[PDB]
Amino acid sequence: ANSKSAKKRAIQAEKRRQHNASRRSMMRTYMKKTVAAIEAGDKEAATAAFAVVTPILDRMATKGLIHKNKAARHKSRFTAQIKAL
Amino acid sequence: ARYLGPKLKLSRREGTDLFLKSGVRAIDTKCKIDNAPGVHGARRGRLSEYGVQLREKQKVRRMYGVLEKQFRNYYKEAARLKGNTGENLLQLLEGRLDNVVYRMGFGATRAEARQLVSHKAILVNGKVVNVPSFKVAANDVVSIREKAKQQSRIKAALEVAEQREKPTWIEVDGGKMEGTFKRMPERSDLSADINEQLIVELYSK
Amino acid sequence: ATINQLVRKPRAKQVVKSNVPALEACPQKRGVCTRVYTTTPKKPNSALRKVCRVRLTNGFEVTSYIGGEGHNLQEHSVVLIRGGRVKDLPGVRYHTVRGALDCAGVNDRKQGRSKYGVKRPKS
């Protein structure tokens, strides 16, 4: 990068990438836990996992890591998919 | 540019008087007017329609001392303007300041008129105009700056213009050395020797 | 032609052709003379007409006329060519611009000098 500012932006963007990746990774891990249980079939364990993920999804939506709409989608789908069990 | 070269030569080609000298001596006494310029001057015959048109166009240009690019623009305006393209063209040429200071008599020729205009001798509505081709409108007052009110060429030219017929569309107090362009001339007011029709026709050809 | 015929297949625009294809729609073109020779006109006409084969910058080889009396063009002269058929000479579609690059003005021309590259006589 030519300018000092460009060089900084690059550094910052890296730290943010690392941060976002960690958070995304986690939110995904907790989503996979719901998905696992809905696939296994366990209407209890599914709701349990879903209670862990709901805050995370809503938090990450406000903190920008995902959109509100994406949180809604996952929550809505997951709810149907458990109720379905 | 302005055509700077021998004047009567032009009149000889056009076969007429263009008034390029003050009319103190008759054009015939200063030149062989009935012969064209040059060694083939006493040999005139068939001109084409094109030549006939061309001559008429040149007659009018040379009278008013306008070059082609300007003259063609005048035609374009005369056309754009409402009504008679031929008449419009003449009233455009007649509305020029260098012509208007000639018609009033401040200049003995249209070329002296132009020098007067260029050299900042002339006011229009009390402002100094030194553009020959400025379009004097109706009820405009062309005057002479107090500086130039003492130029004897001007006094001269007033008495030269006494020798001509008066413009009935221009009023002049030559004592106060100011004139009013009362109104634009009609076709009837001007020379009927001019066939404007041919010039319109030339600029379709 | 009926309207319905014209609706089915409209009237065809006509492909025009350039007489000066080598210029490639440029006003002039530089080339190097490969041969400077003379050729005889098509008959009714009789002369020895000074021409040059020229390799242009766009890689065309063309024959250009060398107009006016006398010229200084050897093989390897760098000339500018313009458009212009010579009616007499079948093949010649270009003129060599006299008075431009290695081509010199026609010596001791005094009318139409600009066409032949000759400067104004110091009077």
């Binding site: - | - | 309207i3 319905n4 014209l6 609706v7 409209p10």
Partner: protein, 79 residues
């Protein structure tokens, strides 16, 4: 309610009518009025319509790659 009428011209797709809409246009050059045809894949939920039927369709959201029209009403069924 800017709908467009037309005629079913295929029905072989599941839940999809191809409908041929027909415009009568003055020719830009030659002045003659000319039949021109827009085909427009519409959506038919119930597989109601059949090849030949005259239907009224309406523009909607994209329902597939090529379907952004929907069957309003069948106007006249085929012989």
């Amino acid at each position: 309610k800017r709908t467009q009428q037309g005629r079913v011209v295929s029905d072989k797709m599941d839940k999809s009518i191809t409908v041929a809409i027909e415009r009568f246009v003055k020719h830009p050059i030659y002045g003659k009025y000319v039949k021109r045809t827009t085909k427009v894949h519409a959506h038919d939920e119930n597989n109601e319509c059949g090849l030949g039927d005259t239907v009224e369709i309406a523009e909607c959201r994209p329902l597939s790659k090529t379907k952004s029209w929907t069957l309003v009403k069948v106007l006249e069924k085929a012989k």
